[PDB]
Amino acid sequence: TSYVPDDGLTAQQLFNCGDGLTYNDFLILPGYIDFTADQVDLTSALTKKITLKTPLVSSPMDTVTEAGMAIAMALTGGIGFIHHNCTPEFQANEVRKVKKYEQGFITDPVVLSPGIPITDTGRMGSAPAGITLKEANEILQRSKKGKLPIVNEDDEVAIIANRDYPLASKDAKKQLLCGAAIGTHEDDKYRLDLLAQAGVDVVVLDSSQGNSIFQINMIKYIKDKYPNLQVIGGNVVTAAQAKNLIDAGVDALRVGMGSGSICITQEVLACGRPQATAVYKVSEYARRFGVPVIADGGIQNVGHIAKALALGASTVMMGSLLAATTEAPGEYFFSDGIRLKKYRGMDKGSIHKFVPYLIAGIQHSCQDIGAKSLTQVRAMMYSGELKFEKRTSSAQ
Amino acid sequence: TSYVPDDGLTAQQLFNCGDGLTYNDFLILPGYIDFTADQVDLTSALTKKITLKTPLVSSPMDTVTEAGMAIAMALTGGIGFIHHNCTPEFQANEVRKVKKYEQGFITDPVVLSPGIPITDTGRMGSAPAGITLKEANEILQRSKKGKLPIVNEDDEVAIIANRDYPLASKDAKKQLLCGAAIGTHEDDKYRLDLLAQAGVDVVVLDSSQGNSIFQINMIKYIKDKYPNLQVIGGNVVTAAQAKNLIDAGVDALRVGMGSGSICITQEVLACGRPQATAVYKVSEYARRFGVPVIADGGIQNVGHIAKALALGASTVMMGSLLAATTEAPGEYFFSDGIRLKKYRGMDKGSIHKFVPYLIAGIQHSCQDIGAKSLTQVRAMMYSGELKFEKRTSSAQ
Amino acid sequence: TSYVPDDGLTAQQLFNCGDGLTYNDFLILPGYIDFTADQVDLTSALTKKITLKTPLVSSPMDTVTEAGMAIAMALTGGIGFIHHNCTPEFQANEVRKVKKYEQGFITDPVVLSPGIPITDTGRMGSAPAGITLKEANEILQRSKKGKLPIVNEDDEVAIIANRDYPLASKDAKKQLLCGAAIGTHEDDKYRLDLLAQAGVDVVVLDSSQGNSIFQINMIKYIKDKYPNLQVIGGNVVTAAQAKNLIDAGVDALRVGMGSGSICITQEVLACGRPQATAVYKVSEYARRFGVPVIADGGIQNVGHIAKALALGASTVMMGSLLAATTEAPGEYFFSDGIRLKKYRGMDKGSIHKFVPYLIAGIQHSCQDIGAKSLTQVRAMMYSGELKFEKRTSSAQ
Amino acid sequence: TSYVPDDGLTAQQLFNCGDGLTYNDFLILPGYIDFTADQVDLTSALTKKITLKTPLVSSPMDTVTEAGMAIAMALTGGIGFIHHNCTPEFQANEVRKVKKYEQGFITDPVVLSPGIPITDTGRMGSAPAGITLKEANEILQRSKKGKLPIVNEDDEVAIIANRDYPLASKDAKKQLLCGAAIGTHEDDKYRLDLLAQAGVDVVVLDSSQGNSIFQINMIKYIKDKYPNLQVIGGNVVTAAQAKNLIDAGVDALRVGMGSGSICITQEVLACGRPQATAVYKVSEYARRFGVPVIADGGIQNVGHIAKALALGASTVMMGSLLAATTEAPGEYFFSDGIRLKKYRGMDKGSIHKFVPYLIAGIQHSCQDIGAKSLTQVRAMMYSGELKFEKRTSSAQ
Ligand SMILES: NC(=O)c1ccc[n+]([C@@H]2O[C@H](COP(=O)([O-])OP(=O)(O)OC[C@H]3O[C@@H](n4cnc5c(N)ncnc54)[C@H](O)[C@@H]3O)[C@@H](O)[C@H]2O)c1
């Protein structure tokens, strides 16, 4: 015969009709493999102009992402978003700590509470620039002590006493990219400014319902005042929502609502769509304007991610799934028996182990379906080459 | 493009076809926000002639509503229903305690078991009326003691020794509205009478199956004998049921069956429809006659309420969800660890904190969908502007 | 308007199409009440010729029904089925103990291990017959002892030392009806005979798959040899199955498979249909020949029963649901805390409290839908007057 | 009437349309029995040329199958697959231990760590061949010791000091069949060779996604180099997958993915179809080329097996379900209370009790539906004579 029937449904005929499907309600029928997983290119687009080596993005949650988390996240091919549950000052400070982080040089010396190296952030208190970490790394040995204060040719930078990150994510001026979330109220315009000044690359307008006149004007504002800053619009779950925000000027959309971790109020309130039908719906529209979508919320394993990207998502934001990694802010562990952490509002190794592990699964995931890039995975579903199968309740 | 497709299903095409949907089987896709939540008007109709500032209503359950509960409930914008698991006398007494409650004046002085202020409910045993609480509140100071017996200009009323309730619910004669449930047996006609005399504003005919010749005649009776009393018909779940009761004369319908808390017998018996398809179905009919519907049963969070009202409900009755508030009758707490209360038949702060909190969520709920009033939320669904999405088992 | 739409689905359009519905997958929309529950006539047909006052029937399980259970069961309006996990002799003995039980007279005197009243089952060892229990009940007083051996006018019956059962179930010769289950192997023909001789009214051919050449011939056999004995055919779940058995001669069908309690092997094996689609399907066919159906298995509450009968069932068999009653054979209780009993193979008051309680719920169940008899409930569904509503997984 | 309607759906109309059904989402409506279960012929085809008496096959898991397990498995009518989590040498050794096992003769004497019988695997260190176990079994008695070293007529085989297996599975040269799994990497070609030399009958290419250029070439290779060796292709779940592998030359397909036990990575990853829709789909295609399918994964009880075979499967592979049997490799038991075993990666009696028990249920399963052979069960479903019924979530 050599004919072989036909299987699965096309993403459309499956996600565009009275569904309400979550990541666990379907699977993706496998294809033909003819290459190894390592060749699976994960290059993803965070925003129109910003692009990462991997599609991983950590959440602006007070328990997930902070200066530490963001840095590792960028070095490992992703990006982090500094939350905003702290005075604008301390947050914009966290951005700097990251935007300044040069692989090697100790950042955040100890002047006076934000051992003490006395001085005035460039005023010799107590090392020629342009030198390679090697030169000084040895110089310290003869210094018969440890560190070594660096500075310009006029006694006016920082200190320092297998570190390769081939995929890390820097900006034009070779610096780890960093983002942060803000609100849409007035007070945020200041906060934003401080952040802008601290060197932030992208600002995501943090909100449960981003389709408000408030988020709109906030977009237009930023888009105008700061033409060199990518803005990510409030949380949406439909195209009717994405439209405005896209017209207001967003450079990416953050999809998700009634998914992931809750804080207070009502995560499952009146409104709260399944994170698959949403990602599919919203992306399908967003792509029409070249606006990427971040699948924010509801990721528990690598599989979820593959599925997230396969439906139209360019990147995927995770919170909890990352919280257990060490680079997450906190302390309230019990080593006697089991897992319990604390989350507050208004185990799992270094991210340098975790992220590499995710990328493996994601590449492997793209391999099983015969795809060699997150882009060929998306092209395959919009074409119908990629076939899905729905799973029953009892089934699951 | 600027076109943007179409999403969700209209409430009809979703609730009028072999469904059997509960509050958790669907969500409500969000709209466009362009105003703040506080502007969300919750004015709701309890009955044809009675109207509250909020849509909240507490249940005639021996563990949920009693004189205390009702009072707070009315002051905070709702209304309570005194249960009827007590001799007609003690119940009709509870009504008075509420209908008499004047913000300030101590009610239910201690004559002789229903410190003692001796007298004869107006016969000087042991204060000029028309006086403002301030006048006497000071007078007591000079009285060098505490209280102060008040009375008419003929030595023949009561005593007294940020209290603002802008939204409280009073009747023409400025008094906290109060309701109570009764049965449809003979003995209830007396009970009813006592209640009528105690000043009750609405009487809800308590019953699992309200479409009986018994409830009908009971309606007609009351409607006749007491032309100034709003009657709420037995529990229904279809339009065929609501019809009779509406024709018998009801001024509101109480929808619900096989939902919420159980007592004895069979809550899930042969008959017991999902509280969403029912609220939708019954309301759709009731509105045709100007008869409001109380969505009674199955409310666990604010979300449920928004969904309840969005489907056609004018008000929502809660029992358990309120039981933990302090104004609920009881005592059997354990402060060592967790929740356990007792319910008997034939934690959570003051209601002045809870109700305000519900109203917040409900207003917020109306905000997310772009509605500015519970009425514009209903108008939007009957029009199809409001769009829903069904959720799978596995999904949920 | 006074029109009122249309609701629910007819039993057919709901149970005759790719369903596989269990008792919990649907509910029964309520009707109009215009009479009290006590007027709800539960007269049901166990077999073509045998008819009970109630539709209750206890299972031939070694832990549910035995001489004790059967007796109470018959007195309270039902019937029991003595299991067959004991030599044919002891089982056929249990039948007699029941077929002999006369309200008042002590049965099973103590001759010599099957205080001792010496004799030879009618041979004066150590009272005029036709006497009323009153006569002798007093006679014993003057006898200055206790009991009183009775006998024929030739010194050759039994002894004896608010008992009204208006609904009990007797045969022509005024004796509590009693049934028992047997197998279809050879050895059973003897067993059967002994039973036949002991006075059994109906024999149910105990089997997981009753549509076998074995059960068929076993039917034909009994039907022939004993023309005055009602036979209940092996367990079935389709009409194709019921046909043969009906043609072989059965006088009732026992529907059920992959439901209720398990013993060994595979209750949920390859084959094992939902007990609702089955009861509906099989009954629909059985009724065509005047052959009643016993809904055997899967009953946890009164509701289940109403639903069972409403779909076409004439009677309902229960096992576990009755096991906790006292009349059930056993002992392995712990009064310190909770429920645990033992079931072995190859709390809850007297049945005089339980059965009356079931009948209440069943009558009440028939009331809610507006039916006055189990027969008018069935007539209403086959007509479509009775309307059902399916319930989702997440719903349930 | 004597007509009797129509029930169930044909396997196609049920498994070839947006389903995603697992073994528990449906049941198989019973037929007509007219023969005893013991007459139910279970002869099944493992591969084109290899055929067993039963359809049972144990998994190549480091915790399920090893030399011991395989032997019993073959003797009881099945076959085992030696896993490959050990150097090629120790694995190929396990094959020999099995391919050599002659019912009676002690195998694997103790020369020197792979009491000691000194020698050189045939070089007299320290019995005429062709002798019956009886001859020597007695000879040992006069030997006044125990064992007895056997050898050729030139002092150059083995030793030895109700054993009937009517259904055991041997090859042409009367030896227990044995198989083993290998990978598709280079290193496996050696491993394979050693195995080939050890006498293995079938090699299953162990892989999560068997439709790779790697598995293909690996097939072609083996098929060529070893024309007398049956090859079982990587794990598949569609026909598009099976095609290649079949064209590459496989002699059987191993169906399954996202089912059973997990090890590491993502069992439920992007891809992972329900083991029923898959078995149905893949078999339907495979049978077109005479290529049998092993339903690998997701078996918890006999029922599952019957269902597995009924949908198109020729054999069924089990892992966990067998792990608890004694012939499974291991030790980490607690006899104080309950079940816990250990599974590691890169109770339940002898299999001589278990396998016989499975065969019973499987025969019984075929009986209930009226089938007398696993083949007539398959022929009945492809014809539509065999009818299925879907089960709801809530149902299940
Ligand atoms: N990070 C996320 O993606 C996400 C998702 C869900 C909930 N949340 C959190 O839950 C909290 C409460 O719910 P939310 O998300 O709707 O809060 P939000 O920050 O989106 O704003 C809440 C409401 O206040 C009003 N508002 C906002 N800015 C205003 C302004 N400048 N002037 C006047 N009114 C203004 C709007 O009605 C808005 O709905 C948020 O503060 C947010 O931190 C965040």
Ligand SMILES: NC(=O)c1ccc[n+]([C@@H]2O[C@H](COP(=O)([O-])OP(=O)(O)OC[C@H]3O[C@@H](n4cnc5c(N)ncnc54)[C@H](O)[C@@H]3O)[C@@H](O)[C@H]2O)c1
């Ligand atoms: N509050 C509610 O909305 C609600 C809901 C479900 C159950 N329940 C409680 O469960 C209890 C038992 O079930 P119910 O709700 O059907 O009880 P009910 O009060 O509605 O009456 C029970 C039955 O008694 C009969 N009856 C009622 N009044 C009669 C009269 N005057 N004369 C003759 N017969 C009369 C009717 O057959 C009626 O179905 C009720 O008493 C009620 O308190 C209440």
Ligand SMILES: NC(=O)c1ccc[n+]([C@@H]2O[C@H](COP(=O)([O-])OP(=O)(O)OC[C@H]3O[C@@H](n4cnc5c(N)ncnc54)[C@H](O)[C@@H]3O)[C@@H](O)[C@H]2O)c1
């Ligand atoms: N009581 C019930 O309704 C019910 C339901 C499910 C299982 N069971 C119990 O499970 C046990 C095992 O399964 P089952 O119900 O199929 O058992 P069964 O009593 O129906 O007989 C089992 C098998 O033995 C064969 N057989 C029966 N009588 C025979 C005869 N006279 N000559 C030759 N062969 C004969 C038939 O193949 C039959 O399928 C049964 O003994 C029964 O007690 C009972």
Ligand SMILES: NC(=O)c1ccc[n+]([C@@H]2O[C@H](COP(=O)([O-])OP(=O)(O)OC[C@H]3O[C@@H](n4cnc5c(N)ncnc54)[C@H](O)[C@@H]3O)[C@@H](O)[C@H]2O)c1
């Ligand atoms: N036994 C089963 O049926 C089964 C099912 C699921 C998972 N697993 C286990 O999970 C492990 C990891 O996942 P997997 O099943 O995809 O592993 P695998 O053995 O199928 O190979 C993994 C990947 O390595 C590459 N590869 C394989 N052979 C190669 C070669 N010769 N040259 C270059 N590249 C090659 C391919 O991309 C392949 O997808 C496997 O090793 C397997 O043991 C087994």
